[PDB]
Structures are given as structure tokens and as C-alpha cells.
Symmetry: C3
Subunit: 321 residues, 3 copies
């Protein structure tokens, strides 16, 4: 059948050969049968979703079997035949719940390489499949083995820097897509879709399965599953929430430290320092600022051209059209 | 006497022999008399709270002394004996206001290894004992010597990365306690207590002498001296203040960008985007009115639900 | 003429000889005619604003020329003479809109070395002269060359760390000014002015062409073009508005509470309540605490000794003189 995805990965394993992470230089959405027929008899692949650990010799086999077909995947596999780490040709048949850390890592590479957009990928059950790892300057270190390597570094007058301890690495250690700025790459997880013309400032955050159409100025927090449409501005410290799936529309402006708990339609504005939730009651207005009625914000969710603001004289949350 | 604490460290000194930081691989709280008796003669330790420098040769002597007493300390000493960096043995008879840089570091270590909890140790006058230090990829660097090292790196087409300039280092370059998540480790100082099951996200922060029993999802700012009970939450970008001892009870929820200037009791609730302090007047409820009181008075009461009324801007509590 | 500035730099170039960044150890504001006379012939410098590449051999000639005029610059040039990286000598007759990457970098160096203050240097058109770059543990890497290197690191079992993708690098990687703490150096850009006796906590942020006179605790976000006067405080997570209209500045001895936000220039000894956000149009209940009139915040901008606050019983935004 027509594969969902395939990728030749180079990862790291804990002392017991359990995977900690895997790097995928050039992952493919819907590979071609000519690439797949070449490698398929080599991987000992038959069908399904398989994470097939393979050898340095086979890397030379594959590099050859792709001479003529897909030079980049071929040139990728030449390089991988020199690899000091272990290899995992991962081949998915369907967009299905991951059944491996190694497939989990492939699937996060698709969002980040922009090969798929948020929610175009099954990330049901993924958390159990991502070992909580020490992210350090030498790479991935298993939590059980850390203190050891920390001490040895100190003896040699050196430092083993531990810059995150989480089940997600930061995206940029695997991929920086085109036209992107990220001031503090600690703040953007792998699995984030950062669209062309997006500038994530130091105060911005972007979770896995979440992000920006591009362009956009993100100075606030983009929660898991949230998507921000083109032309939008998230101000400093502003919050989105992670039931209902929060989204932001096109040309929206969210002021500094504002909070949104409802979907914002296109060309929406939210005043700095205003937190709106689904249950928050809002004093609706008309083309003037005469009252029309009071309503719950949930019932304004998705509406275009709204201006949410706090009346400073009576503490009333207003909305203008 | 029975020692409060002891630990064998490897640290860094500046050209003028002043200590910048100390790394303690296995600090001991209430070390047995057997260990102390084996180690005191070699160190020159008689009494009190002391940061005693010791030599590569003394490391071998100590290693042998602790064979048949404590294997783990004996093995550390064997590693230590091979060090390229100066060694210090910190023996504290009592828990008192620190009297050295090495002692201060040891006491931050006791918190971050979870051997003691926030407020359990005397940290009075710690600030002067913790030199402001450039934290870099090669290790700790003295501010007076940094600009020269920065230059030399660029000549070799290398970078001397200066990722913090402060008196406290980040915790995880010394210690990662069990069952712990920290999204961005710049955000947790050495001296923070990070309880098992706690996951600290990118916007979460924890100061020294503060932290979490665990579990918890910390996405906000736990100031110095603030402890947060089991199963409590601190949503994105919230804040706690660091006079009156601020804490958070068990099973509590705190909203995003909210701010607590009072000690919240068990199972308390604060609204997202809602800041309260000890002087902010709140409308108490039963939601019929009872009386307008200052949040300082409710401080400690369990099972509350703080909120801001979206029509009249009134701060309320139920 | 008298030069506005000159500086000798060692920098990084991409494959096509384009500058990615320049490091200046000892930049000079208003350098002597004696220093400029020694170097102008050797560099081929006549006039104008120039960034002239010079050779390792020219470095020796410059070093020799400056023995007896300026020893430190001579001492730097002898170091630069041995360097593994390209050199550039930036000489600027006038403080004007940058015309090269090397010049743009110098001006940010002039700011972060405290040789000039925010708004004392012409920074117009600086975004297009600052190339977007990957800031890694091996230095600056061109975005076009990154993926190849990210691959090679994994194959040697190492990690090329990408800690920022941006047009501005973090300041402390170039210069740490005396008498300063910065908890998380990610949050202070090159071009920041961090006055003596400033602490920037982890949640603090200082953009280029902004900063602090000193002393002061900055736990909140100082935007581009904002200068905070001596002895003032910015609490955890607070906000200033930038202009990227009217330039926002904070006066001396001011207090700004956690999560609060300023959209007006605050005069001396001003105070703002924690969690309170004010803008130019925000209508405020002015007091003496007996009412006087409900006026726009813009008319108070710059006034000394004010105390802005939110009335917790009726939501009213006030200001007690
Ligand atoms: N605010 C939520 C936090 C959810 C934590 C995600 C994790 O467990 O690593 C979000 O941004 O999605
Ligand atoms: N409680 C802390 C205060 C900031 C610490 C400042 C210092 O280390 O000199 C906080 O607001 O998180
Ligand atoms: N809030 C604004 C952000 C300015 C844009 C940041 C950039 O494109 O380098 C400020 O700090 O002034």
C-alpha cells in the first residue's frame, strides 16, 4: 500500500538498547513506490508500521539500491554508513497511533519540517513512548546514567551542561525550517509548526502539534493543538489554553498578557491584560458603543471583526463590532 | 559531636585562589560517627563548620579510610583523587548561617538533592558568600578573567558561551533529582526542591530555598521561600511573592498570569488573570454576600474559589 | 575628519564570503586623530563609513604602527594577526544609518559596552543589515549550511546545539559589562544597555537599543527603545510597549508590579499595581483619595509621584497623587 511515511534515522540508545531519540534528516510524507521497492526487501519489511533497526553494511546496500532513484536519500544513506550511532529505517503504512518511540520521533519531525500541519497526524498515546531524557551538550543521556557523566566532566575540569530534562527535545536541535526566527529556541518544542515569516520572540512558546500559518509575531504561549492563522500578532506573555480546541484566526492581535479561552475569528483584537474564557460574560456593543445585550464569550467564539476590551471605569468586559 | 552534614567536593577557583563554585556528588545529611571518625584525622578537622581543602594524595588516604565503612564515599574519593580541579571537604558540626562559599554550595546541594526541605536550613547571609560568576560551557569563570577568555575563543573560531551571569548556578548542572521534569533548566536555580512527579514547564520558575512536594505542573514562578503542596498546579506565567511566609496548599489550582501575595490553603482556587495581595478587598460568598474582607484574613482557609466578576470588576471568593 | 567610531573586529563569514557577525574586543567612540592617522594609510581608508577587510599581514603592520600611540589597540592587533577568522576594520566618520553588517554590529557593541546610551546612535534600517543566523555552540552558522552540519554532528555521536535563530545574538556572548547580573543571558540582546548595578532576573528581558541606567531589578520585559531610569524596578512578568506613535521610558525610582503593563512614559518615583495594565487611552480616576476628574492616561505621562491602581470593588482604574 501507499506508505504514509518513511525516514532513515540515526538515534541514541540507553545502556539496555532502548531508544532515547532519533534524528531524521530528510523525512518523507507519502514516499514513492520506486524508493520503497528498492529498500523494502532490504529492511525485512512486509507491511504495517515498523521501526526496523538496520546495519552499517545495509546502509551501503541501500545507498546503492537508491542510486538512480532519489539521490538525496541515497546520499543520506552513504553518510549514515559512517554513523557512530544506531540506525532505524521507520516505515509507516497508515496514519495510526504510534507503536514506537522511533515512530513517535518520526511523527514529530513531520510537523516541524512542515510536512504535515497540526492535527494532520495521529499523536494518540505518544507521551508513554517518549522517554524522559537528559538533554545535554553531548546529546541524549538516560536519567539513570546522568550523575555519573556529570561527575567525570567535573574531574576533567569540564562541564556536562544539562539544558532541559523533558520528554520533548527542542525543535531546532533537529530542524530549523525556512524564513523562521526563534530568539530562544528553548521555547519551541519539537512537533511545532513554525510557518514562513514567523518570528517567535524570547517570551513566545510553541508546543508540539501547535503553531503558526506564517507570517506572525509570537511573543506569547501557543498551547498543544493550537493554530494561529496568517498575519496575526501574539503579544508578550499572552496565553492560549490547551472541552474545545482553541484557535486564532487571520490578522488577529492579542495584547500583552491577555488570555484567550475561546476561538478567535478573523481580524479579532483582544486588549492587553484581558483574560477571556468560555464562561466570561461580555457587554456586547453595536457600531456605536451603546449596549445591545450581555452574552457568554463562547457564543462569540469564531466571529470575525470583534474588539474585546476592559472598561476601565467599571471593570466591565466589552466587545465592539 | 554528631555532624549536621558533610560532603567531598570538587570546585573551581579564580587566579586569586577564591572559590567560585563547588560540585558535591554525594552529600551526606547526618553522616555516621564511623565515617567522621575515619575522615577527621586525615583532614585536620576538630570541630565547628569548616571548608577544608585537601590534596590528591589525601583523597587516596581518605578513599582507603572509608573502605569497609562506606563504599560509595570511598569510590567517590577514588574518582576525586584523579581530579584536575581543586578539592574541598565540607564538615558542618551544626546547621548555622553559612561561613563560606563551599558551605553555601553544600547547603544549596542539600535542598536540591531533597535531603532537606525549604526553610529547614539556615541560609542567612548567603548572598555575600556566592560570588557573581560567569556560567559558561567550559565551566565557571571569574568576571575579571572573562573578557580575555572570550577573545581567545574567537581567535580559534570557537565560542565561549556565557549562558548566565549570576550568584546562583542552575540546578541541573549539579543535580537532577528523581522523577523530575524541567522544560528549560535556566529556570530552576541550585537550591530549589523539585519533588517527585513535578513537571516544570518552560514558563515555570523555581528559586533557591523554595519548591514542590510533588506532584505538580509548574508553569509559573515559585519565589524564594515558597513551598507548594502535593498535586497542586501553577498555570502558565502565574506568580507568587517572596513580611509574611507565602506558601501553597495541597491540590490547589492557580490560573495563568494570576498572582498570589498570600498563603493559599489546601484545595484553594485562583482565577486566570486574577492578581490578589494581602491588602486587596474581596467579596466573600456562601453566591450571596457575607462581608467585604481583606485577603490576608482568608489566608490559610481551605476549599476556596477566588475570582473576578466580569460585569462589575468585583473580586470575589466562594 | 574626527571619526564618530572605529573598531577592529574578527568575524564569521558564510561560504560566499558574506559576514554573519563581527566580534569587537575594544571598540572606540570618538577615536583620536593620532590613532586614525596611524591606520588610515595601511587600511586604504580615505573617508566615509567603511568596513574594510584586512589581512593577517596588515594586522602586524597596524600593530607596529600603533606601538607608541595606543598600546591596547596595538596589543589587540597582535592577537588578531594570528587569528583563524577574517578581520575587518570598521571606521565611521558619522553616526548614520548603517550601511553594512560590520557597522551594524559595531553600533550594537557601542551600546552594550555602555559607550553610548539608547537613542544616542543612528540604528535606522538595521534589520536588513543583520542577517538571520543560527547561533550554535560552534559560533554563527548560515541557515543554508546548518542542516548539513546538524547531520554530521549526529554521525560523530555529537550534537550541534542551536540555541537561537535570530538577527541579533545574545549580548553576553560578546560582552559582559562591569557590575552586572543577568540570570538568563538568552533574554538580553546585543545592543542592550545594562547599567551598573542592574540585575535582570530570569523573567526579565532587554531588547536592543534599550535598557537601564542602573541600579534596578528587572524581572520584566523592556522593549526596544525603552530606557529605565536609576533605582527603578520592573516586577515579575510586567510589560512595556515598544514602537516596532510614542517612545515609552521609565523614570528614576519607579515601581511596576508583577504582570502589570505600561503603555505611557512613566515619570519619576511612579508606581503601578501588580496585574494592572495601562495604555495611553485608558481613562483613570484621578484623586487628591477624593475624585478630581476622569482623564486619559496620556495627559499624565511624565508627571512625577503617581500611584496607579485598580479598585477591587468596582474595577475602577485610579491614580493617587
Ligand atoms: N498549557 C499546556 C501545558 C501542557 C503540558 C505539556 C506536557 O505535559 O509536556 C500546553 O501548553 O499544552
Ligand atoms: N523571589 C525572587 C526575587 C528575585 C531574586 C533576586 C536576586 O537573586 O537577587 C523572585 O521574584 O523570583
Ligand atoms: N515588543 C517589541 C518586539 C519588537 C520585534 C522584535 C524583532 O523583530 O526583533 C519590542 O520588544 O520592542
Amino acid at each position: 500500500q501507499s506508505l504514509f511515511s518513511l525516514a532513515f534515522g540515526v538515534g541514541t540508545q540507553n545502556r539496555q538498547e532502548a531508544w532515547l531519540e532519533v534524528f531524521y534528516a530528510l523525512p518523507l510524507l507519502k514516499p514513492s513506490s520506486e524508493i520503497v521497492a528498492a529498500v523494502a526487501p532490504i529492511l525485512g519489511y512486509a507491511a504495517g508500521n515498523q521501526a526496523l533497526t538496520f546495519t552499517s553494511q545495509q546502509a551501503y546496500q541501500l545507498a546503492d539500491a537508491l542510486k538512480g532513484i532519489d539521490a538525496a536519500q541515497s546520499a543520506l544513506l552513504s553518510r549514515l554508513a559512517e554513523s557512530q550511532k544506531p540506525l532505524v529505517a521507520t516505515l509507516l503504512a497508515e496514519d495510526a497511533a504510534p507503536s514506537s518511540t522511533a515512530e513517535a520521533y518520526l511523527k514529530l519531525h513531520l510537523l516541524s519540517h512542515r510536512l504535515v500541519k497540526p492535527h494532520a497526524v495521529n499523536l494518540s498515546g505518544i507521551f508513554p513512548l517518549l522517554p524522559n531524557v537528559a538533554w545535554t551538550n553531548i546529546g541524549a543521556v538516560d536519567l539513570a546514567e546522568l550523575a555519573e557523566l556529570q561527575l567525570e566532566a567535573r574531574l576533567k575540569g569540564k562541564l556536562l551542561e544539562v539544558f532541559s530534562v523533558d520528554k520533548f527535545p527542542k525543535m531546532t536541535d533537529y530542524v530549523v525550517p525556512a524564513g523562521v526566527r526563534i530568539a530562544d529556541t528553548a521555547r519551541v518544542r519539537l512537533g511545532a509548526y513554525i510557518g514562513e515569516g514567523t518570528t517567535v520572540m524570547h517570551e513566545g512558546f510553541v508546543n508540539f502539534n501547535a503553531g503558526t500559518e506564517g507570517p506572525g509575531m509570537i511573543e506569547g504561549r501557543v498551547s498543544a493543538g493550537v493554530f494561529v492563522g496568517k498575519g496575526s500578532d501574539l503579544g508578550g506573555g499572552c496565553s492560549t489554553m490547551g472541552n474545545i480546541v482553541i484557535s486564532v484566526g487571520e490578522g488577529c492581535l492579542i495584547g500583552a498578557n491577555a488570555g484567550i479561552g475561546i476561538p478567535l475569528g478573523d481580524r479579532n483584537i483582544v486588549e492587553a491584560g484581558l483574560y477571556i474564557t468560555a464562561g466570561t460574560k461580555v457587554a456586547l456593543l453595536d457600531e456605536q458603543n451603546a449596549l445591545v445585550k450581555v452574552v457568554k464569550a463562547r457564543d462569540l467564539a469564531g466571529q470575525p471583526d470583534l474588539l474585546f476590551r476592559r472598561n476601565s471605569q467599571n471593570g466591565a468586559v466589552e466587545c465592539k463590532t
